[model samples]
Target chain A: AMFSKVNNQKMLEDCFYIRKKVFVEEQGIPEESEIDEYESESIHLIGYDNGQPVATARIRPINETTVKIERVAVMKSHRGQGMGRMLMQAVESLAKDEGFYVATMNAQCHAIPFYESLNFKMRGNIFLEEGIEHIEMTKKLT
Target chain B: SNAMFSKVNNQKMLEDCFYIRKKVFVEEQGIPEESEIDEYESESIHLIGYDNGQPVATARIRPINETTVKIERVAVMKSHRGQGMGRMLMQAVESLAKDEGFYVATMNAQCHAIPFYESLNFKMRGNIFLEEGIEHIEMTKKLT
Candidate 1:
């Protein structure tokens, strides 16, 4: 299946494989930011076809009515594939179901075009975070 | 994020859904298109799953009566088989049926998948027979 809500530890580890490679090894994002404090409380998703996980992200709860989408990273070979878009769609669906009207993300400036392509409108001005320029984006899911 | 389930109502989703069945039943199991893809598609509530946007599993549920829905054409891609996608689709259709006010659900499951269905609380209800040249039996689950 395309996007399963991770409800177990073993599967969450599978999600870590993608995050570590993309956010740590490739981009040099610090381990602290790469493995954020909110991870344990967030929803982890892994994108896989043929059973090899090629992408991952987290849906973190902020309140009863809001969620922050974070760490959506795809493997090198699988970049530019539609898995990122599908993962966004799946998490948005879950957000809508949880009674959320808006979903938020702090997207890297380089990936702003990608998030914009998914109809996640950019809101606030750009700023530096974890050594990379980032911007706020949100989708009205309801 | 590893598994996704969606209702196949749009053209694009419907096509992706058919690909899963196309690989499982027609490409691998030798079932013919005429027999596999049928008229029920128009009346059924179709559910599909994907692995990284690649179609991996699908099932369709059509109402049989005011209180019952029939699950049909349940299939998962070969590489993803036995990896819990089948149960995901099964539980999804079951929940969909219940949401639609269905009190019970039924399926003509391939005999080999009976245990799989049984694991999801579906009980064998009838003797095995052939459908699309494969052995199948009636399985049912009460929705609560």
Candidate 2:
């Protein structure tokens, strides 16, 4: 597998694919509602296998000290291969290089343990967002 | 001011553009950052709207072809809204398209802004669509 950042156009296409596969197709997130109109500002990462995009994530700086990790998805066939962890590591490293001290994400309830394994501790009460149970998780940078 | 406008290169302008979008679209509008504005930007033309040395608003125009541009990331600071800054920003982009020799520009206007674009001679092209949980419609204008 290869990891790299993609152009905004490619990022949009690949992310739309992942979102369609994960959110719209699997999780029932309405495409019209899940895809925002302002996608021209975030940094995107994609992991490719044999030149096919299989995993993706995005990072946006919330402030000089905080970064938000969003839209993390690995193709269904590519799951359990540590791709998610790899993508998370890429975002974390990038965040560190950009001088961020904290990385936060809202993990799906079922995925809390996965984030916990990555050193992200729970921070907020459980709640429903977009019809999915989620909790806020944060990992402090060293 | 011309030097400032020309100095606002693509990369820096895009960074500021997204930052302001996050403030309006995500934080204030309650839109999800991850699935919405967090995925596409590196290739978009980020335009900054400045006022008195402050970055007041921002927008982006993505090229669809030699003759078409898709306007995205339209936003203004809460304090700057209702002052016609958004219209000024749109006109600036329209001017940019004209300078590039493009004759048409389009955008998925949030439902509330349909009239705003219409006032600028943009015609609605479709039924309302849902984006990041917000209602929007495609609007286009001819800019020769």
Candidate 3:
């Protein structure tokens, strides 16, 4: 499987497919908030296997030197294969290439360890987003 | 502002359609997000109506049979309501249906919106029913 930056409606649609399945169906995230206002401003990424989208994520500008990652998800059938790590690596590489100094995300409580393993450290207290608990995490890109 | 209706052919227009739907169906009516954004999205023909460059209405059409198309997710933003945006949007959708060689158009009209659909010549064909916990009735219009 390989990850690529989404540049078209087709790829964006595919990214939403994985997101709706994982976040909405499995995690009970509100469908309304699943695709929110940041979409057009964000840089989207999708993981493809045999031309099928299997994982998805996106990044948006937080400041001149910081980028925030959001909406990371992988298909249930395709998990346990390190797809999430690979996808995150690609995103971090893109952020670093673009001259960003730090990457941030509001990591769900259960996924904190997974993000921590990727060098992300908690930055703030947990808070409610759409009724789910999330805490901010950040990683230095330089 | 005059409403400009167009087919959603790009990422921006498509996102606008979803945005309007999320506002109308999910946020306003309390419809579940999962039920509003369904599996048929990629296969459907989506339309977004803009008022002075702001997307305020949206709908989608997908063929349910050889001669008919089903219209779903018909929504206009609350701020844009009380105008004729809904009527104009439906007219554009029906025009697309006719242009695509479809003989009929159908939709599940929310209970309160049946009169609005009826105003556009759609006639109810079934009793009220529950879909995603909201009362709706099947309505159809013959394309001329």
DockQ of each: 0.01, 0.04, 0.04
Give model 3's TM-score for chain A to 2 decimal places: 0.93
- lDDT (CA) per prediction: 0.79, 0.76, 0.84
Tens digit per residue, CA lDDT, model 2, B33-126: 5544544455456678777867778887778888898888788889888987877788787877677668889899999998888888899997
lDDT of 1 by residue, A28-109 (tens): 6643244445667787777777788887788888888779998788889877768888888888887777677778999899
Highest TM-score against the true fold, candidate:
3
Q: What are the RMSDs of all candidates, in order?
A: 17.7, 17.5, 16.2
- Model 2, position B6, has a per-residue lDDT of 26
- For model 1, the stretches where C-alpha displacement exceeds 4 angstroms are A1-142, B1-3
> Top model by lDDT, which number?
3
* Second chain TM-score, each model: 0.92, 0.86, 0.93
Q: Rank the candidates by TM-score, best first.
A: 3, 2, 1
- Candidate 3 per-residue lDDT, tens place, A1-142, comes to 3888888866877887899789977887755457765677788889888778899898899889999998899999889899999989988987887778889899998899899899999987999876789999999986
After superposing candidate 2, which stretches have Cα over 4 Å from the reference?
B1-144
Which candidate, 1 or 3, has the higher DockQ?
A: 3
* Candidates in descending DockQ order: 3, 2, 1
In candidate 3, stretches whose alpha carbon ends up further than 4 angstroms from where it belongs are: A1-142, B1-3
After the best TM-score superposition of candidate 2, give how far the Cα of residue A139 lies from its true spot, in angstroms.
Answer: 0.8
Candidate 1 vs 3: which has more TM-score: 3
Q: In model 3, which residue pairs have backbone atoms overlapping below 3 Å?
A: none
